[PDB]
Paper text:
Unusually, in the RM system Esp1396I, the C-protein also represses the MTase (M) gene by binding to the promoter at the transcriptional start site, denoted OM where the C/R genes and the M gene are transcribed convergently from different promoters. Flexibility in this loop is very important for DNA sequence recognition, as it has been observed in the nucleoprotein structures to adopt different conformations depending on which operator site the protein is bound to.
The KD for the S52A interaction with the OM operator was 5 fold higher than the wild type, confirming the importance of this hydrogen bond interaction in stabilising the DNA-protein complex. Five of the monomers in the asymmetric unit are observed to be in loop conformation I but the sixth more closely resembles that of conformation II, which is almost identical to that in the DNA-protein complex with the 19OM operator site. Both of the R46A crystal structures and the S52A crystal structure have adopted loop conformation III, despite the varying buffer conditions and crystallographic interactions in those three structures. The SO4 based interaction observed in the high-resolution wild type structure is also observed in the Y37A, S52A and monoclinic R46A structures. Both the monoclinic R46A and S52A structures show almost identical crystal contacts to those of the triclinic wild type protein, even though the space group and unit cell are different.
Residue numbers in the entry:
A (entry chain A), B (entry chain A): 3 to 79
Write the structure that this text describes.
Amino acid sequence: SFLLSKVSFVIKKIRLEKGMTQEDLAYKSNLDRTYISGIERNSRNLTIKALELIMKGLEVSDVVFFEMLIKEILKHD
Amino acid sequence: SFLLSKVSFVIKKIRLEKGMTQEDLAYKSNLDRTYISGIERNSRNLTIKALELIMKGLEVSDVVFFEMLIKEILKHD
């Protein structure tokens, strides 16, 4: 769906804005690299806990993440 | 965490605002009643797909859900 695609999109966008590789985000989020690579392809099975760990490893607040997600939904869906 | 607690909080708040029982939301979200009851206690393992199904079964847009979540984080965390 559009929402699944844009959750993965926003995670990859912030990660690249911070200059982080998938390996850097894996180490910082406590989730292994094939998990990060999988979630960025398809967020269907990403859990709210894993998403909190990723926001922490990105050093982005939950509020900012969700605001960037709402902007992408409003401007593109 | 605060975020896990407020995801469950916002789901239960909207469900009660719509006058729905847990059984009504289960039927409408395609998720069984013990899953709904579990997520409202602790959203740790709720997935983004299950959360999209719940927003659909609540007939709430993703944008509104996330806006209510940001308000609860900003005003209470």
